[PDB]
Design a protein around this ligand. Structure first.
Ligand code: HEC
Ligand code: HEC
Lengths: 126, 126
């Protein structure tokens, strides 16, 4: 869907920015600093589910460039592993949000956050 | 969800960039230059449906700034009108995509595109 590889760069940066806002905006709820409204969180996690699927195609074949570390493309199998892990953690977060229990939300949110951190430690520039 | 108003700016720019890629990537299909796969388009329009709801809250009260024209906030009622129009056109595009007919897709895609253009003509900087 990208006329030139730089268009893939701009797309994935935007996808990560959004996806991220939709994860991080729940931090005060998970910590108990903001109230837990099960319906609010269920709706937000549905948006995060959609967004969480979007960056990865724009890091695929022929999208070399941008600021990210080059092992995304030179070790493509290993970037897909970190991706599978993250997308599986998102499914667990959707289940917690759909159940409407804050304890399960806290646990799944931690699971997702650790998988965010893992990929960033390996593949973002230092 | 934004720590400072600049975070709303970065969010809405990203939302518009994505949402836009998901609309514009269908142009070759609408024109007949790429093949029409009803299931492919239905899935893409579901992603566009989600994205199309996201920019507007980040142009709401207290989000003044960025590059956009100031009438977004000084004439907030009139920006919401152009928004209602766009979101209603998106519902028509979802119906066309779910029906799986290229003729209806072409018509609804034109309807959406005109509503994209209208808001940009009024509210983006020149
Ligand atoms: C690997 C499979 C990733 C997963 C899982 C997550 N992120 Fe990530 N992220 C990844 C890369 C390779 C980069 C570098 C992109 C670049 O601009 O060089 C990023 C970057 C981000 C950013 C910054 C984006 C920007 O436009 O500057 C954010 C805000 C971000 N990542 C957040 C984030 C969150 C919250 C995640 C889990 C919910 C997450 N990322 C997962 C790779 C990967
Ligand atoms: C008014 C209710 C809008 C509707 C409907 C659409 N867009 Fe728009 N768009 C709007 C504003 C006020 C701006 C300016 C933002 C800025 O950065 O100053 C934009 C901008 C865009 C952009 C550029 C974003 C960027 O990061 O530079 C794009 C790619 C864009 N708009 C596309 C777009 C599409 C495809 C639309 C219909 C599917 C659409 N916009 C609708 C306001 C409004």
């Amino acid at each position: 869907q990208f006329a030139k590889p730089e268009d893939a760069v701009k797309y994935r940066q935007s996808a990560l920015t959004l996806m991220a806002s939709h994860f991080g905006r729940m931090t005060p709820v998970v910590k108990g600093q903001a109230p837990y409204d099960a319906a609010q969180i269920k709706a937000n996690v549905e948006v995060l589910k959609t967004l969480s699927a979007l960056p990865w195609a724009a890091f695929g074949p022929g999208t070399e460039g941008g600021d990210a570390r080059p092992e995304i493309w030179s070790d493509a199998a290993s970037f897909k592993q970190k991706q599978q892990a993250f997308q599986d953690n998102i499914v667990k977060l959707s289940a917690a949000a759909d159940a409407g229990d804050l304890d399960k939300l806290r646990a799944a949110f931690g699971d997702v956050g650790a998988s965010c951190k893992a990929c960033h430690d390996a593949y973002a520039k230092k």
